[PDB]
Amino acid sequence: STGSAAQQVLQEIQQFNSPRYFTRASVARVPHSSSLQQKLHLPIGLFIRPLAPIRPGSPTVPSVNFGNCGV
Amino acid sequence: EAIRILAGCAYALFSGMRHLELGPKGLQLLLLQDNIQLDEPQIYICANAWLAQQGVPGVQRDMAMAVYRSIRFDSMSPSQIQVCRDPLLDSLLLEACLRKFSHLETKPRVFPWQGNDQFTVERDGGLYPVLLKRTSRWAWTLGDSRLINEALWGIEVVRTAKGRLHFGIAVEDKTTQSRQVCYLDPAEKAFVTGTITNEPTAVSYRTVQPGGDVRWYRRLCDGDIVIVRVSVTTSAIHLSIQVLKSRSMRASYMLALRSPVQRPFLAIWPFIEAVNIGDTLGVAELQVEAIDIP
Amino acid sequence: EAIRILAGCAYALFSGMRHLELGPKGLQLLLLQDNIQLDEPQIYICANAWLAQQGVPGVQRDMAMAVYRSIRFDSMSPSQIQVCRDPLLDSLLLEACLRKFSHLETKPRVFPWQGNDQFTVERDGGLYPVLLKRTSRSLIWAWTLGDSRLINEALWGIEVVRTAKGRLHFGIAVEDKTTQSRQVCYLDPAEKAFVTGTITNEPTAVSYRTVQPGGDVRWYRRLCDGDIVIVRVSVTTSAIHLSIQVLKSRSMRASYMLALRSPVCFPGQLLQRPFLAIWPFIEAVNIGDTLGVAELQVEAIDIP
């Protein structure tokens, strides 16, 4: 109840997500019903910095290569 | 505020009989704390040794009654029940073993090493982790976190064959919203920070952290007791790792607070790491180095 | 000699509050016997009321200590020892523990409605059978069994929780001849008589049924919900009697005595009442009857 449904999404969404400085969302979750979104009156959106400068003490981006396959 | 500190550092407070110096009002509200660093068999032994020199007639029996009633008796092995079932407080032994049967035991407010697929933990009758064994179904495991300002904790190495054990603490970073962890590597002779994830076989971002003095010469072996000291100040935390009765195994390092910190209160998960399959690490809260009373 | 012959009938000594009929220096051995049919709470409410109705120093303190020590209550289901948890005593309440955790303990001295093969014992939590439910781990004819106790007179009882209008069996089990037939007794409401058979281990089938003459087993009712069936056994030097009466029906007194017995047992020493050490022959056949220990009535059974 309430915190149980909360912990079963927060512990798997944020940990596999692109980090804080790279991308910024307004609301962490998304409505389903059409009449629900019409009543909420908040803009759902996102801000993406691709080449955001990495701060110290933060994970560097990997440089993964597929190699000989190229697929 | 004194016994907020003393509950966290109850590892050495209950190791060299330093709780004996505490008064009657003192140990009553210290035992009522949720941060005591012992198992309740050693809590009962230290309480009875305390009652020997001051107290143990109706008022004295009531003062003893208050001391025992703050101790949870529901985390025992039945063998430790049947060796010290003194016939004056056994009404407590029944109310706590019945919640053992009905599985509604009170919260132990201690750190149990959480079970996972590579570090099995086996208990002796109660909720207290007796030994922590490395199995297979670097690998790490966290014990439960406490809000601390000066805490002490440590374990004894029951058995090891390759001696690759890393000791440290886990800190929840809130400035950058990470879970970066700090420990000590006897192989590199320096303190090491990385980070942890949900699967406990990964410690990423291997990074050297200089500025601490390390004096170690030989690998961890059987019968070695390790003591870990944490002391959170306004800007940094003292991290000491030493071996009891060994002047040649001591180290301390100053890690800067990523989140600088109530009077430096912070939630820290105890940390352990091992590779060797079959390594047993007994969780011993410093069974009493007794002051030999003349 | 009074107490062992009394011990087969539990169901009588206590009954409708007739433990207080007895006297001192005799009841402590009654709780020390190994033949009592009852689950403990019916016994202990009679031990509490036995220490009542006098007003209960000197002898009275260790009399209460000896009665409750002879009460087997430190093998109880632990949920029922929070019930009647008294602040008077815990030096003989002792564990209620310990022997329970590490599984070495006193003799249960109770036993009935044992379950094997397609039958399980539903404990109240500690050790004690109070039910056998017909389980289906994998509607075929079968049977089940109890254990041994040297009986002269037994009055062990039955209760019914749900039945689907009858479809049940009763009787006893005796080992009396040279090479192990284990002759049993097979009362039914169907074949109008006693159809006693034989046992060669193997609980999933019965063998060698035989219709028997000499019963009065007439059939007023259809064994409705919530009946109590009293099984009475009398051991004589040449036959074994049984009785399957129904308790608040003014009827239904089925009776028989079985065939000849080859051995005999005599504890002796001024009585020659024989023992045989019979086993019970409780039986359930439908998903239905869970049976078990009946409640110990309100008023009386044959003691007045």
Given an 8 Å threshold on Cβ–Cβ distance, is A57 in contact with B177?
no
Query: How is residue A22 annotated by DSSP?
Result: T
Given an 8 Å threshold on Cβ–Cβ distance, is A58 in contact with B176?
yes
A55 touches chain B (CB under 8 A): yes
CB within 8 Å of B265: residues ≥ 6 apart:
B147, B148, B149, B232
* Nearest partner of C230 among C132, C141, C300, C131, judged by Cα: C300
Single-letter residue type at B228: V
Chain B contact probe: residue of C74, C82, C90 with most B CBs at under 10 A: C90
Given an 8 Å threshold on Cβ–Cβ distance, is A11 in contact with B198?
yes
Instruction: Select the residue of B82, B87, B98 nearest C98 (Cβ to Cβ).
Output: B82
Contacting subunits of B (3+ beta carbon pairs below 8 A): A, C
- Bridge-partner residues for B194, per DSSP? B181
- Rounded to whole angstroms, the Cα distance separating B193 from B178 reads 13
- Rounded to whole angstroms, the Cα distance separating C119 from B277 reads 44
- Rounded to whole angstroms, the Cα distance separating B19 from B151 reads 15
- Residue numbers in B near C100 (CB within 8 A): 101
- Residue numbers in A near B180 (CB within 8 A): 57
- Rounded to whole angstroms, the Cα distance separating B112 from B110 reads 6
Q: Report DSSP letters for C68-118, one per residue.
A: HHHS--TTS-THHHHTT--TT--TTT--SSTTTTSS---------S---SS
- Rounded to whole angstroms, the Cα distance separating B279 from B133 reads 6
Are C47 and C71 in contact by the 8 Å Cβ rule? The answer is: yes
CB within 8 Å of C55: residues ≥ 6 apart:
none
- Rounded to whole angstroms, the Cα distance separating C64 from C48 reads 9
User: What are the start-end ranges of the H helices in chain C?
Assistant: 2-7, 10-13, 27-30, 40-51, 59-70, 79-82
Q: What are phi and psi of A26, to 5 degrees?
A: -75, -60
Chain A contact probe: residue of B176, B177, B196, B259 with most A CBs at under 10 A: B176
- Rounded to whole angstroms, the Cα distance separating C159 from A8 reads 49
How close are the terminal C-alpha atoms of chain B, in Å?
33
Place of tokens 């590892």: B11
Chain C: residue nearest B102 by CA? C79
Q: Report DSSP letters for B163-212, one per residue.
A: --EEEEEEE-BTTTTB-EEEEEETTTTEEEEEEE-SSTT-EEEEEEE-S-
* Max Cα–Cα distance, chain B, nearest Å: 63
C104-116 core/surface letters (b: 16 or more CB in 10 A; e: else): eeeeeebbbbbbe
Q: At what angle do helices B58-69 and B40-53 cross, to 10 degrees?
A: 160
Neighbours of B121 (CB within 10 A): 19
Are C107 and C126 in contact by the 8 Å Cβ rule? The answer is: no
- Bridge-partner residues for A24, per DSSP? A47
- Entry resolution (Å): 3.5
Given an 8 Å threshold on Cβ–Cβ distance, is C97 in contact with B102?
no
CB within 8 Å of C24: residues ≥ 6 apart:
C63
